[PDB]
Amino acid sequence: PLAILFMAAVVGTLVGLAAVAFDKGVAWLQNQRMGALVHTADNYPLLLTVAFLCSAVLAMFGYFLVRKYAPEAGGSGIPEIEGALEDQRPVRWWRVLPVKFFGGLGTLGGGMVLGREGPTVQIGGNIGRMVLDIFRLKGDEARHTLLATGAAAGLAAAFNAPLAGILFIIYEMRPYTLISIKAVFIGVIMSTIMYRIFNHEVALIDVGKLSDAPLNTLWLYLILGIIFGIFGPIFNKWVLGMQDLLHRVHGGNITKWVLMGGAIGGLCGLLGFVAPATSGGGFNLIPIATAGNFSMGMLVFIFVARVITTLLCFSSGAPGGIFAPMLALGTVLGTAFGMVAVELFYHLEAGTFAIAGMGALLAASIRAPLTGIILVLEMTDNYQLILPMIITGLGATLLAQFTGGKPLYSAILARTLAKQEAE
Amino acid sequence: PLAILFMAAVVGTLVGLAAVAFDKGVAWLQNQRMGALVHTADNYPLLLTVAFLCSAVLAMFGYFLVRKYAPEAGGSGIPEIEGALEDQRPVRWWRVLPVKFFGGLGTLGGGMVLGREGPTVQIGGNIGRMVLDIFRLKGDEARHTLLATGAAAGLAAAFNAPLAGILFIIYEMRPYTLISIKAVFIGVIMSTIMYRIFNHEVALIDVGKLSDAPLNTLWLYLILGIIFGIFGPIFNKWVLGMQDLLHRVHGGNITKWVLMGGAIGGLCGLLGFVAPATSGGGFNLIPIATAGNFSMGMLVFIFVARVITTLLCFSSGAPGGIFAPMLALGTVLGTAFGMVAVELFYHLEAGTFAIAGMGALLAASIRAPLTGIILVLEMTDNYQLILPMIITGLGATLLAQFTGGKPLYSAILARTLAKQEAE
Numbered sequence A, B: 001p002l003a004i005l006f007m008a009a010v011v012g013t014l015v016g017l018a019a020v021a022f023d024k025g026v027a028w029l030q031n032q033r034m035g036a037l038v039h040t041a042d043n044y045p046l047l048l049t050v051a052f053l054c055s056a057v058l059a060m061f062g063y064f065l066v067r068k069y070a071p072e073a074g075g076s077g078i079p080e081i082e083g084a085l086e087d088q089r090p091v092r093w094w095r096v097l098p099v100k101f102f103g104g105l106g107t108l109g110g111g112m113v114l115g116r117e118g119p120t121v122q123i124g125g126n127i128g129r130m131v132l133d134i135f136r137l138k139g140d141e142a143r144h145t146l147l148a149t150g151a152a153a154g155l156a157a158a159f160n161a162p163l164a165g166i167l168f169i170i171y172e173m174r175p176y177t178l179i180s181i182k183a184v185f186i187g188v189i190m191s192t193i194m195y196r197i198f199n200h201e202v203a204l205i206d207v208g209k210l211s212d213a214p215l216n217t218l219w220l221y222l223i224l225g226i227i228f229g230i231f232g233p234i235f236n237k238w239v240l241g242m243q244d245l246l247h248r249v250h251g252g253n254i255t256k257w258v259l260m261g262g263a264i265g266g267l268c269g270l271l272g273f274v275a276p277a278t279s280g281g282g283f284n285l286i287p288i289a290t291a292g293n294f295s296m297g298m299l300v301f302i303f304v305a306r307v308i309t310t311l312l313c314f315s316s317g318a319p320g321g322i323f324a325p326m327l328a329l330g331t332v333l334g335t336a337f338g339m340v341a342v343e344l345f346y347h348l349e350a351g352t353f354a355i356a357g358m359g360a361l362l363a364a365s366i367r368a369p370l371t372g373i374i375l376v377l378e379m380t381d382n383y384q385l386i387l388p389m390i391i392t393g394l395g396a397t398l399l400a401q402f403t404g405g406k407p408l409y410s411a412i413l414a415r416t417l418a419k420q421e422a423e
């Protein structure tokens, strides 16, 4: 039906504006947190206290909204869209949309280590469901198609990356008709154009162009892969385990949870001023890191800072994503390997192994190799590292297989589902 | 098995060198055809006669080798690799490899309107089969996996485009295990690196960087799509029909066929000197055309010249591809629409609609939309036209659906199969 191809356009266009706002939203909440500190930019004990509390409040707000009204708006929300496409999960958009948005401005705006793609995809998905209900389109086809174009449009707008969005939903989320593919395109065209209208000529990741990688250099990317390939499934266990560790801290009780959350949002809000490249989504430090401005000491610091703050903010059921984070760890560890590879040798530039590393964690952890490659392509515009990036991918994603890990988003879903049976 | 991931490396590396030679091969045969004319670069009637006969011979040679020894080495050879993956077609590499190669140097070297990707994929496929037999690996898994990495490696090396190769085989040839995907990667890494070792710092398509497309400009790409979207299935009928039209000219008889072929190879060899941008694979004129050096009159000439020479050389069962051709028609028609769109208006540059058009025919005719997009990306390195290109794709590939056409490569196979039942 022409119906869905039309519907898909409108879902794209809503998901576009939806995400643009969630941006201008987070954007604006951080401007405030500047003024909160520029008022108190003398009294140093106070400076640190507002920094904390401002953030600690906003997390709690968001944390509350999830645990009050929309439980399944904790975490990424992508395992929920996975589950929905599997007809294993409801899409309660009437609850989820307003929660995941004001929830997300909570924790992202307080500067916790979460990405927008968490929100934008679950939202974008819920929005696809919302229009399906409104026009009361009947069938599995239309239920799934709008669900998916919503996700695709969400992800596209998170990273200004239409090709990424299409690839990830249509191809790297398990085994789509002829038309539902085009719906997803139409969904992702509109979504992008919206973002592009309200954002054009301001990128998320500047790195200009780095050099090629010499053919003699390539074998190194494969090793970087192999490392990410064992690290990915370890870090998965950590995020899966840490969900439990922080659950023995509050047993389910909402007041305990919203206290924990604002501690964890405050901590992060604090690190906002003191140690900036340990907070945020990653997108500030990625280019600073890729330009090579970080003393390998600082690298291993930021790496461990962020691998802890990431697990802390994400595994603690906050509304937010672990996708932008896994780009920033990708870059920071890529850079390190990079410097170590330059010292150890060839015509290398640690720069190029950041780019390569950036997508490597998506390959290793969530097991979307092509999405990762095409994403860093679209974000950095470094055409010239595609073969390294394919090589890093293979390595990352072969080891992650043999080291026995599973796709993070599925393992999350398959818990959520085993829980909604043994209860 | 580690066995196939190893095997896949060796298939990649053979398919790499295989294709590199088929290049240096065609490369070298055309150097000769220069000297044949630079000898006779006064006597103008003679100049034209060697030009013809040189080419007319080489076609016949190749045409002979197909019709003598390896029938299923006529045409693209990709419908055969399709059919093989479906277990519907044998892969007689012992016959096909030496035919498709020396066959292909025949017709490509004589400057007929065929692409290398025809050869390189069927060859690359056959090479995957060849190593499967040599190590006598048992199973469907390994039969299919090496077959596919061979195809993927072939296509990658045809266009120096690893991401294209992976995408097309793994995703845009119908509904692959976990490991057979990685085999295909490993296959395509090696294949590329080989090509890259023997070719680096000399591209197939220079166009530098053109400008963006303004959001106000986008709707135009969709119309260009819509046009390609009706043209694709028409041009399919033509190539399918023309196979028959040229078959009522020789009823099957080899001597008739090899005469027809050398006429058609001679014709093309002639147009080599007289009207160059009507002969070859396209890759010379694509950039000349995209730079905008062609008077819209000349465009519509070259368009009709090539749509006839293409159908003539391809539908006449020559060893060669209709993929590079469909890039050159993509570009020439994109450019035209381009000029007409500039005249009619906005901040346009016909340049950008060439790029867009280039992949549009792959989308419309063979129905590999993403492969087409990612290919022109990898070949031109114009990052900045991805959203136009997605838009052109949708348009191209929606209409091609509703206008009722099928994927060219499948329709070819499904004939070949209906023939091998009603006989």
Ligand SMILES: [Cl-]
Binding pocket: A076, A078, A115, A117, A118, A320, A321, A322, A323, A324
């Ligand atoms: Cl996420």
Ligand SMILES: [Cl-]
Binding pocket: B076, B078, B115, B117, B118, B320, B321, B322, B323, B324
């Ligand atoms: Cl072809």
